[PDB]
């Protein structure tokens, strides 16, 4: 026998999921673990140094990582980068230099995103002053720094436009940025106030439809941003809670804590009882399934102590993640059905993602 390298991942792209392991106890050795959701098989990994972030290109061909290096790890010059990796060979291809202010923090989806057309990576900076950075993938360059987004946080792409995204601002409204084909800001707009920052703060994680996004609040309300036009129209609140729910103080909690099944309009939310100040990141006692058209709950199931989720539209799947274990659900019907649990998928993960299959 002869040991060989150069091999590709053994399972088709459509089977693959990506568990971003922060490895917080040893955060300089964060990595992405690649699994087959159909059978729990470990397929490979991508190293991501200190507090990596990850996404898969919309066309499914590449993995993008964002990380920080120093010449001697704990001393020496800092280098913040995006890296492009081949998705099938799990090999490094190119490094894109960033200014030394990329966000260092937990793996919310909205810190490291891309335009719908896949041509630009859109990332959150904090120095601690905030701005949004734009990377041109083809050119391998940082091309724009959106200072208009000062005091805002996170990136919500608009799936109905090629190079548009929104961010949540300190006024409780949304800033929309439309990039030109060069990755520079082509236009922008600011919504009316959507939510009260002081009285009903929202979780940043969107339940993202093709032309609208929903957000849940610390108190269990729902707000919406409709971007079917150039100007975003905002509304809310409606409550997730009926009177019985209120009596037990049910509220949302988690990190990447919501999802939307676009074909049905069902929104999935991690919930727990006995809510009070300080419980907004508690593990899920239940997953609630909400009909966003009727503004009413349709189902509730055990939460398995999950903290983060993600949805695959075309196979009607939901993954949930408790920090270490990934649960795979069929959501083709209103009540989710648990298919399997992948144990020990990570030591400290708050983010799982499917390999994209929908193309650009």
């Amino acid at each position: 026998e002869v040991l060989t390298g150069g091999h590709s991942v053994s399972a088709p792209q459509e089977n693959r999921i990506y568990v971003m392991d922060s490895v917080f106890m040893h955060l300089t050795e964060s990595r992405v673990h690649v699994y087959d959701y159909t059978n729990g098989k470990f397929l490979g990994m991508v190293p991501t140094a200190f507090n990596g972030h990850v996404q898969v290109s919309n066309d499914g061909k590449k993995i993008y990582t964002m990380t920080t290096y120093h010449e001697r790890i704990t001393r020496g010059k800092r280098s913040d980068v995006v890296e492009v990796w081949d998705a099938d060979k799990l090999t490094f291809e190119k490094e894109i230099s960033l200014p030394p202010k990329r966000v260092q923090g937990l793996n919310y989806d909205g810190l490291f995103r891309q335009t719908t057309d896949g041509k630009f990576i859109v990332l959150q900076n904090a120095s601690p002053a905030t701005s949004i950075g734009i990377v041109d993938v083809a050119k391998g360059d940082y091309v724009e720094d959106v200072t208009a987004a000062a005091g805002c946080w996170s990136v919500i792409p608009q799936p109905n436009r090629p190079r548009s995204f929104m961010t949540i601002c300190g006024d409780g409204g949304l800033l929309t940025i439309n990039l030109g084909e060069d990755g520079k800001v082509a236009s922008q707009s600011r919504s009316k106030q959507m939510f009260s920052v002081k009285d009903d703060p929202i979780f940043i994680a969107p339940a993202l439809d093709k032309d609208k996004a929903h957000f849940v609040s610390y108190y269990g309300n729902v707000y919406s941003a409709d971007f079917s036009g150039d100007e975003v129209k905002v509304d809310g609140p409606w409550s997730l809670l009926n009177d019985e729910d209120k009596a037990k103080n049910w509220v949302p909690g988690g990190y990447n804590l919501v999802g939307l099944h676009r074909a049905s309009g069902r929104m999935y939310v991690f919930m727990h009882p006995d809510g009070k100040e300080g419980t907004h990141k508690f593990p899920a006692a239940e997953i609630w399934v909400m009909d966003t058209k009727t503004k009413q709950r349709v189902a509730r199931i055990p939460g398995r102590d999950a903290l983060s989720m993600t949805i695959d539209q075309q196979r009607n799947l939901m993954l949930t993640l408790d920090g270490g274990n990934v649960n795979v659900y069929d959501i083709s019907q209103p009540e989710p059905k648990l298919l399997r649990t992948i144990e020990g998928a990570a030591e400290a993960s708050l983010q799982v993602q499917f390999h994209p299959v929908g193309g650009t």
């Binding site: 106890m25 955060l27 300089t28 120093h70 937990l106 904090a126 905030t130 990190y255 990141k281």
Partner: protein, 122 residues
């Protein structure tokens, strides 16, 4: 005023995530990492910036402003991990937010441990 003076308290009390002033700590308590509540472990550097908030002191019944500075430039301490969230808010209220590395502007941003510095009455 023992409740305001952690160095005079039982170490077991101060090293607990339930200690009153640790109400929005996400990270490893520096007092369990070879430092104290107000001193970085040897060879780690204070952050010039931090998240902040108020915590209620049940011992004297008053509310205090806390600054949750980090110590930086050494790899993760690993001891006394806390994830308390009282009055913590998302990154659109950035200085109340604790899911970011408050070592981010240090000469070396590697996160070592975090603590709760008492600024004064709220």
């Amino acid at each position: 005023h023992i409740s305001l003076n952690p160095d005079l308290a039982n170490e077991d009390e101060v090293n607990s995530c339930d200690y009153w002033r640790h109400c929005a700590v996400d990270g490893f308590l520096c007092s369990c990492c070879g430092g104290t509540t107000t001193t970085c472990p040897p060879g780690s550097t204070p952050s010039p910036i931090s998240w902040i908030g108020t915590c209620h002191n049940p011992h004297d019944g008053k509310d205090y402003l806390i600054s949750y500075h980090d110590c930086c430039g050494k790899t993760a301490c690993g001891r006394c991990q806390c994830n308390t969230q009282t009055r913590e808010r998302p990154g659109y209220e950035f200085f109340l937010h604790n899911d970011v590395n408050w070592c981010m502007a240090n000469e070396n941003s590697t996160f070592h441990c975090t603590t709760s510095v008492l600024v004064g009455l709220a």
